[PDB]
Amino acid sequence: ITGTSTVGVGRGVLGDQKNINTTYSTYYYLQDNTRGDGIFTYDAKYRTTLPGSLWADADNQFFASYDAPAVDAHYYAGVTYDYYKNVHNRLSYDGNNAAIRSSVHYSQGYNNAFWNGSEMVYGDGDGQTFIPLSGGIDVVAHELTHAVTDYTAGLIYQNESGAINEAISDIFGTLVEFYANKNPDWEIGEDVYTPGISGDSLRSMSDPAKYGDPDHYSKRYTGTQDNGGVHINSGIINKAAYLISQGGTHYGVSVVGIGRDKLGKIFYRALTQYLTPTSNFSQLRAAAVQSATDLYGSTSQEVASVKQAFDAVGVK
Ligand SMILES: [Ca+2]
Numbered sequence: 001i002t003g004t005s006t007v008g009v010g011r012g013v014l015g016d017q018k019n020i021n022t023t024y025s026t027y028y029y030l031q032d033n034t035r036g037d038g039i040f041t042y043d044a045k046y047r048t049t050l051p052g053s054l055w056a057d058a059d060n061q062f063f064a065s066y067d068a069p070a071v072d073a074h075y076y077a078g079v080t081y082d083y084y085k086n087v088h089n090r091l092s093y094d095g096n097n098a099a100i101r102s103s104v105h106y107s108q109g110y111n112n113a114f115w116n117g118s119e120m121v122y123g124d125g126d127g128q129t130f131i132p133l134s135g136g137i138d139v140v141a142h143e144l145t146h147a148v149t150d151y152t153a154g155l156i157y158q159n160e161s162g163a164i165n166e167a168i169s170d171i172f173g174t175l176v177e178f179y180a181n182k183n184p185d186w187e188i189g190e191d192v193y194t195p196g197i198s199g200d201s202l203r204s205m206s207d208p209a210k211y212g213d214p215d216h217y218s219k220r221y222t223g224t225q226d227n228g229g230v231h232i233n234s235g236i237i238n239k240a241a242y243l244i245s246q247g248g249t250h251y252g253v254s255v256v257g258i259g260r261d262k263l264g265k266i267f268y269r270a271l272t273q274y275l276t277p278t279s280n281f282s283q284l285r286a287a288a289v290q291s292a293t294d295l296y297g298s299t300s301q302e303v304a305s306v307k308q309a310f311d312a313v314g315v316k
């Protein structure tokens, strides 16, 4: 919409108060003109036609229950924008300040969120397995990262390339969480998963096996469910990313951790410069090793730790 830039206030899914950038033109819209070509949040109104209607509010205050998923989708889309721009010098997901669109209240009781090729989509959860999924900053950044991957490496969403696709979204989803520095962890989805059960998550990067995902190549799933296990075998790469950043000893192989920023630098580089749509795990190792070499030198610790971490999870 054409209008003037304003700042509204409301509460997110977890009941936290936050300011949001809006656009006033009779109504106040969830349209943030301060980031690239804009961040736009829509109401799917419990239906599945997308994107639905640009979110409109009469008084620029967003504290209703119904408002909360929109407030967080909007706000966390902005935090993710800020991460990519400030940390990687990347302007939106296409690198050219593409408008970021999100729809909330998608369908009824929908326990999921996704990037559909064009925009982000968030279910409200059934209230049991999930509460509105835009309440999780790692979920929002995971999904937006699929757009980044789609515009860069273009990893095909199947088999090893798809598990790499998934881990990349888990990796930057988590780095955005740390960036916002609000209860950050190496778990995925903990802020919106199973409100009746504390301490669990969708997946874990630091120990994928805690939810049955493999933490070594030898345990890879080789069936054809989940598109060949993209959300399953992602644990093997998630674990390596974790070790590269935080270090440790896994199945007897020790990894010297080099911290989150260098992890993010190495994986960003690999994603944008070396991975291709059909890259497998082995090719990811090569890409990350060359990225580190590019960045820190062939004889660096950084290179050694990337090698150690991939060794630790069995991928050569
Ligand atoms: Ca209002």
Ligand SMILES: [Ca+2]
Pocket: 177, 182, 183, 184, 185, 190, 191
């Ligand atoms: Ca957290």
Ligand SMILES: [Ca+2]
Pocket: 138, 174, 177, 184, 185, 186, 187, 188, 189, 190
């Ligand atoms: Ca998390």
Ligand SMILES: [Ca+2]
Pocket: 190, 192, 193, 194, 195, 196, 197, 198, 199, 200, 201
């Ligand atoms: Ca829970």
Ligand SMILES: [Cu+]
Pocket: 142, 143, 146, 166, 169
């Ligand atoms: Cu995903």
